[PDB]
Structure 1
Amino acid sequence: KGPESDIVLSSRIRLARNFEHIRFPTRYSNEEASSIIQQFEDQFSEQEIPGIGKFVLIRMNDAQPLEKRVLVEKHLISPNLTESPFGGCLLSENEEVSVMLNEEDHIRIQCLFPGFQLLEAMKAANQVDDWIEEKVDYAFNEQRGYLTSCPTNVGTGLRASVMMHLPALVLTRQINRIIPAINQLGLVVRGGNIFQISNQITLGKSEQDIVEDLNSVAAQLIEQERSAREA
């Protein structure tokens, strides 16, 4: 499903956020960790945002182990959070929009869509962002931006990813020239024919500029893989 289902496997948007007045997961107490996940149960767990759907909180404490396996596989949570006591996943019925809680940051919003639809995913994630912001005091600073545990995330707190299947570009030996070009363009690639492309930096650019550039480059890859298949 999704635009370019043949080529792009998915489009991912991730927004890291922390409570202003609560210690980051590096030093916060268990009571602090518990309050965040209760504040999410109370104010978000049975709530609809229109167009995105109903969210339902999964407390990891209450979650069966194989349930956590499926959440890991489906990419709704990360492996560290399976053993996290107060970790949680606030998930839409659609399972496309999720809000991971008490992992590296207090909050990590995720939009994972099928096609090549970065912007739809940006738009959706900024909605969940503003929604949570209505009732949660974000750890923000007008000069440095959103404040996160790692400095690799500070600023926009946005990590944007596109997953692409490019068999023909591997076969044509083109792939060897393209990875060097991606890097010099402010993006990073990782891995038999599946590549994931994300933004390098999170400070000094706007979120529009981040998604814009990632989208532009992904678009040209889409046209190159299609041209290599026609060959």
Structure 2
Amino acid sequence: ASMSLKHFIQDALSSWMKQKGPESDIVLSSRIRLARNFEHIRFPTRYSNEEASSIIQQFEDQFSEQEIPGIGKFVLIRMNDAQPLEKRVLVEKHLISPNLTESPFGGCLLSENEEVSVMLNEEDHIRIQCLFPGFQLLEAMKAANQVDDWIEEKVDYAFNEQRGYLTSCPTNVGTGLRASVMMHLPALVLTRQINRIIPAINQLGLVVRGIYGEAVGNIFQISNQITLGKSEQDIVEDLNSVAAQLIEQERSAREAIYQTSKIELEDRVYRSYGVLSNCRMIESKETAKCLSDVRLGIDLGIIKGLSSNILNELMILTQPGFLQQYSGGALRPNERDIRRAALIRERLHLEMNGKRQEDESI
């Protein structure tokens, strides 16, 4: 574990991702992803070990320890220098894909603030990821373009004038651009409306998946599925428009259940807080259920004195990889449920004692 690997696996929620983005009650994050390949180098499907090593080596040489103004310094993490639990944490923080952990010459060039993650030797040689809190696809696209320009200064992209950027996936040819949004939709699930919505979203060339990428914790990721022939601007508007609708529909449904079944909803969310604050065993499944309830309670003003950032942190912190990393070494499922309960209840008791004791001074 290098000092920079420790830096990226240490915190479940980066300071970058703790910032308040627009519509952050419904949209947790926005992701922009640009795929490219080296000109004259065979796509990862048919390239040699030597080729893959050169891609990583060229990045360590020209981009490691280098900087972009306004984004910060970039550090290169090689998958081969990371223990299995270290790699899982990077997955659970949404910094790398699961498939990157299986790539023998996989690596990722990460900005120190964790806003930019350039995956190397995944499905394409280069996958630039920009991750913003809340709803900011245009802002994420700008950062993506800065990193893209930065890399193209020293890398010649597989490009042709009639097809655009050449990618391994034939559908991906063109912009290499994929946009996804992470959304918390507890009211649309609760009111039994989401299963009549998802089929409509899939009609618009988008795809809906759970947090992993079933929808535990009522968290849904909506991303571009069809991009062949679309411009960058069309790709981002196709997702933006659907997300903005979902923001409105999820808000209306929250206001609806709050107005019609106020006490039942308070009972639901405080009972879930009750579980999190007193349980001695809890699985990931139930944790996700309860965290969703409490987050809905916070958003509606029912659950008081608890910030949403604590909940975002626990959603990552209670994942099985991160929980084992944080506890030091692998753990049986039963042991995890005991450690998870202790971590959640202690983190929660801590947040209500700060809120008790700093509020008391005033």
Q: Partner of 1:154 in structure 2?
A: 173
SS at match of 1:135: coil
1:67 CA displacement: 2.0
Give the 4+ runs in structure 1 shifted more than 3 A. none
CA distance in 2, matches of 1:228, 1:36: 49
Identity %: 100
CA distance in 2, matches of 1:226, 1:150: 37
Partner residue of 1:216 out of 212, 229, 241: 241
Partner residue of 1:196 out of 194, 214, 221: 221
C-alpha distance after superposition, 1:194-231 (max 9, x if no partner): 21111121221111111112111101111111111111
1:130 CA displacement: 1.2
SS at match of 2:149: helix
1:125 CA displacement: 0.6
CA distance in 2, matches of 1:207, 1:106: 20
1:78 CA displacement: 2.1
CA distance in 2, matches of 1:98, 1:175: 31
Range that drifts further, 175-184 or 120-129: 175-184
C-alpha distance after superposition, 1:5-57 (max 9, x if no partner): 22112111111110011111112111111111111011111111111111000
CA distance in 2, matches of 1:173, 1:81: 36
SS at match of 2:172: coil
1:152 CA displacement: 2.6
CA distance in 2, matches of 1:31, 1:144: 28
Q: Partner of 2:163 in structure 1?
A: 144
**Under a length normalisation based on structure 2, what TM-score does the superposition of the two structures give?**
0.61
Alignment of 1:162-201 (within 5 A): 162-190=181-209, 192-201=217-226
C-alpha distance after superposition, 1:111-158 (max 9, x if no partner): 111111111111111111111111101001111111111113111111
1:63 CA displacement: 2.3
Q: CA RMSD in A?
A: 1.4
Cα 1:137/1:181, change in 2 over 3 Å: same
Range that drifts further, 74-83 or 220-229: 74-83
CA distance in 1, matches of 2:139, 2:55: 28
Structure index of larger Rg = 2
CA distance in 1, matches of 2:96, 2:192: 35
Higher relative contact order (CA 8 A, sep 6+): 1
1:186 CA displacement: 2.2
CA distance in 2, matches of 1:81, 1:183: 26
Q: Partner of 1:109 in structure 2?
A: 128
Query: Higher helix fraction: Structure 1 or Structure 2?
Result: 2
CA distance in 2, matches of 1:78, 1:14: 12
Range that drifts further, 69-78 or 35-44: 69-78
CA distance in 2, matches of 1:86, 1:75: 19
Unaligned runs of 5+ in 1: none
1:66 CA displacement: 2.6
1:90 CA displacement: 0.2
SS at match of 1:131: helix
CA distance in 1, matches of 2:208, 2:78: 33
CA distance in 1, matches of 2:87, 2:70: 27
1:163 CA displacement: 1.2
Unaligned runs of 5+ in 2: 1-19, 210-216, 257-362
Query: Higher strand fraction: Structure 1 or Structure 2?
Result: 1
1:173 CA displacement: 2.9
Cα 1:101/1:227, change in 2 over 3 Å: same
1:180 CA displacement: 2.6
Cα 1:214/1:31, change in 2 over 3 Å: same
